[PDB]
Amino acid sequence: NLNAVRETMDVLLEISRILNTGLDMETLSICVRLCEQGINPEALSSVIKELRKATEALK
Amino acid sequence: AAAAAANLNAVRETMDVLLEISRILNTGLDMETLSICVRLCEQGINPEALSSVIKELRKATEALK
Amino acid sequence: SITQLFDDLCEALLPAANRKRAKRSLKKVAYNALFTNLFQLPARNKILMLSFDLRVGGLGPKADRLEELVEELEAVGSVLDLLVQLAGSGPPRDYFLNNKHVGRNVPYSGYDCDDLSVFEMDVQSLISREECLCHSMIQETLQVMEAAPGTGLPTVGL
Amino acid sequence: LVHRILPVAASYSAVTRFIEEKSSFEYGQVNHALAAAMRTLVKEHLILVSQLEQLHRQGLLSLQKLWFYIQPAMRTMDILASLATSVDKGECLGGSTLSLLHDRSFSYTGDSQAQELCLYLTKAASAPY
Amino acid sequence: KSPNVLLQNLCCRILGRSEADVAQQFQYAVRVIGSNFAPTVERDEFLVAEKIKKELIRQRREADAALFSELHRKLHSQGVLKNKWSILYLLLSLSEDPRSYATLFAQALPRDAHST
Amino acid sequence: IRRYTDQRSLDRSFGLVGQSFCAALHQELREYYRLLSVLHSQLQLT
């Protein structure tokens, strides 16, 4: 299982690189675990866009 | 308005002319499919491209039958 | 679980390249922004709906690649539905286009004016960048070196 | 360039003259059907030149484009004009100009652009026989 | 709205399946409609008029072919259509006879003798 | 290529496997003129 999830983490990078996300590998790993929980991914794409705006408002 | 319901009359006029041409040729299309095809042809599309699809989707409902 | 991974996310957005009480403030603004949206096959179709807009917008092989990968992605399901809704949030050659000098059977045809005319444009966007670069490096430094007396770096403000 | 385009006009005058002359009762039911099937292609030439007329009205037709456009239709016209010259030359009517059509039908096999044309006129002209 | 989901509306009408019930056909639809969108051949409403006439001759009708010309008149009198060539070429391609060689018969030009 | 066809297409006493090569040599001139037609449209040149 621990061997499987490394291979899945490597293949899920590819489909997010071709679709040109703003996600890097670390935030990809957190968001792949968060989407697998069951919380609607259509809303998670919006909370990330709001988090990345509110952190830039401080800078 | 009033002049905005006259244009809603002038589109039913056209749609009836197209509905007449659709039946005197005895096509496969019905009036509901035709209302999607008018929207596609308004944008500017190859009619050679849609007809091949429609030729496959009608045999894909013989893959449903 | 995920709310402990969220702490690692809060460490990433904070500059690592102090850093212990600014984290407690950024964590407050993170949690305060997070729950607003959360309080209030048809899945590969969402990728196909953007591959159509790829094909209309030029760039044929990218959409032909995209439809080649959505068959292998079906041969974890909530992840690609996140990717389709993050598809425009991203960061802002080839020797062949018209060589029939290889092969064993190539079809005889004429000119079209949408292959070789847009193969000199594939390079024209490059040559028109590499000189616009020259105007975006001498301007960004002469804006520092000449404004007016009393303008510069904030080390005089120390 | 104009002279390079003109043989398809010289090969339309002869075609329409044949269709008028050999639809009469001095040349029989076979020649009636023969010119009546040659007439279908004449209608098609008339169709083509009107599409090109729509092209010229929009300021999108030139001499170079016209010269390329008429070259596929020149071969068909050439077949019709040579056939009309041959039937007029030997004074062939009845079944001799079904024998001539049998010879000309085997004659054309090179591209199979002209083969279908002659075969249709043989199919139409062999009906009264 | 966008054209791609409108294709799926067509897919709901012709199939008994919904748009959400099939994605193998929509894949093929995205293959065909994309990169052949926006006319790439010469348009002519006149040839389409004479070919709908040519088709009504094949149904052994001469009365309905001259009534079709009055509908063609009414089509222009309202004037709300963008490509009157396209939808009539489309209905003519999907025509079925109620009850050979035709590539040497008049067609539209490819615009490969002209810059696009 | 046009000079050879200039006598072959007016010779009707010749091989019909040679008048198939010659009719695969009318297409090869029509395509040249197609090329020229596209170039003529782009004239409106260095």
From Swiss-Prot, chain A:
Record GO cellular component, one term: gamma-tubulin ring complex
Subcellular location: Cytoplasm, Cytoskeleton, Microtubule organizing center, Centrosome; Cytoplasm, Cytoskeleton, Spindle
Any Gene Ontology biological process: mitotic spindle assembly
Signal peptide range: none
Keywords for the protein's UniProt record, in alphabetical order: Acetylation, Cytoplasm, Cytoskeleton
Similarity remark: Belongs to the MOZART1 family.
Assembly: Associates with the gamma-tubulin ring complex (gTuRC) consisting of TUBGCP2, TUBGCP3, TUBGCP4, TUBGCP5 and TUBGCP6 and gamma-tubulin TUBG1 or TUBG2; within the complex, interacts with TUBGCP3 and TUBGCP6 to form a luminal bridge with actin that stabilizes the initial structure during complex assembly. Interacts with TUBG1.
Reported function: Required for the recruitment and the assembly of the gamma-tubulin ring complex (gTuRC) at the centrosome. The gTuRC regulates the minus-end nucleation of alpha-beta tubulin heterodimers that grow into microtubule protafilaments, a critical step in centrosome duplication and spindle formation.
UniProt-recorded name of the protein: Mitotic-spindle organizing protein 1
Organism: Homo sapiens
Upper taxonomic lineage: Eukaryota, Metazoa, Chordata, Craniata, Vertebrata
Range within the parent protein: 17 to 75 of 82
UniProtKB/Swiss-Prot annotation, chain C:
Family: Belongs to the TUBGCP family.
UniProt subcellular location: Cytoplasm, Cytoskeleton, Microtubule organizing center, Centrosome
Assembly mode: Component of the gamma-tubulin ring complex (gTuRC) consisting of TUBGCP2, TUBGCP3, TUBGCP4, TUBGCP5 and TUBGCP6 and gamma-tubulin TUBG1 or TUBG2. TUBGCP2, TUBGCP3, TUBGCP4, TUBGCP5 and TUBGCP6 assemble in a 5:5:2:1:1 stoichiometry; each is associated with a gamma-tubulin, thereby arranging 14 gamma-tubulins in a helical manner. Gamma-tubulin at the first position is blocked by TUBGCP3 at the last position, allowing 13 protafilaments to grow into a microtubule.
Function: Component of the gamma-tubulin ring complex (gTuRC) which mediates microtubule nucleation. The gTuRC regulates the minus-end nucleation of alpha-beta tubulin heterodimers that grow into microtubule protafilaments, a critical step in centrosome duplication and spindle formation.
Protein name, UniProt field: Gamma-tubulin complex component 6
UniProtKB/Swiss-Prot annotation, chain D:
Superkingdom classification of source: Eukaryota
Effect listed in the UniProt record for changing residue 39 to C: In CDCBM15; uncertain significance
Annotated tissue distribution: Ubiquitously expressed.
Subcellular localization, as worded in the UniProt entry: Cytoplasm, Cytoskeleton, Microtubule organizing center, Centrosome
Signal sequence coordinates: none
Disease with which this protein is associated in UniProt: Cortical dysplasia, complex, with other brain malformations 15: An autosomal recessive disorder characterized by global developmental delay, variably impaired intellectual development, speech delay, facial dysmorphism, microcephaly, and varying degrees of cortical malformations including pachygyria, thin corpus callosum and subcortical band heterotopia. Most patients have generalized seizures.
Quaternary structure note: Component of the gamma-tubulin ring complex (gTuRC) consisting of TUBGCP2, TUBGCP3, TUBGCP4, TUBGCP5 and TUBGCP6 and gamma-tubulin TUBG1 or TUBG2. TUBGCP2, TUBGCP3, TUBGCP4, TUBGCP5 and TUBGCP6 assemble in a 5:5:2:1:1 stoichiometry; each is associated with a gamma-tubulin, thereby arranging 14 gamma-tubulins in a helical manner. Gamma-tubulin at the first position is blocked by TUBGCP3 at the last position, allowing 13 protafilaments to grow into a microtubule.
Family: Belongs to the TUBGCP family.
This protein's name: Gamma-tubulin complex component 2
Organism: Homo sapiens
Record gene name: TUBGCP2
UniProtKB/Swiss-Prot annotation, chain F:
Entry comment describing in which tissues the protein is expressed: Ubiquitously expressed.
Disulphide-bonded residues: none
Cell compartment(s), UniProt: Cytoplasm, Cytoskeleton, Microtubule organizing center, Centrosome
Domain of life: Eukaryota
Family listed: Belongs to the TUBGCP family.
Subunit structure and binding partners: Component of the gamma-tubulin ring complex (gTuRC) consisting of TUBGCP2, TUBGCP3, TUBGCP4, TUBGCP5 and TUBGCP6 and gamma-tubulin TUBG1 or TUBG2. TUBGCP2, TUBGCP3, TUBGCP4, TUBGCP5 and TUBGCP6 assemble in a 5:5:2:1:1 stoichiometry; each is associated with a gamma-tubulin, thereby arranging 14 gamma-tubulins in a helical manner. Gamma-tubulin at the first position is blocked by TUBGCP3 at the last position, allowing 13 protafilaments to grow into a microtubule.
Function: Component of the gamma-tubulin ring complex (gTuRC) which mediates microtubule nucleation. The gTuRC regulates the minus-end nucleation of alpha-beta tubulin heterodimers that grow into microtubule protafilaments, a critical step in centrosome duplication and spindle formation.
Protein name: Gamma-tubulin complex component 3
Organism: Homo sapiens
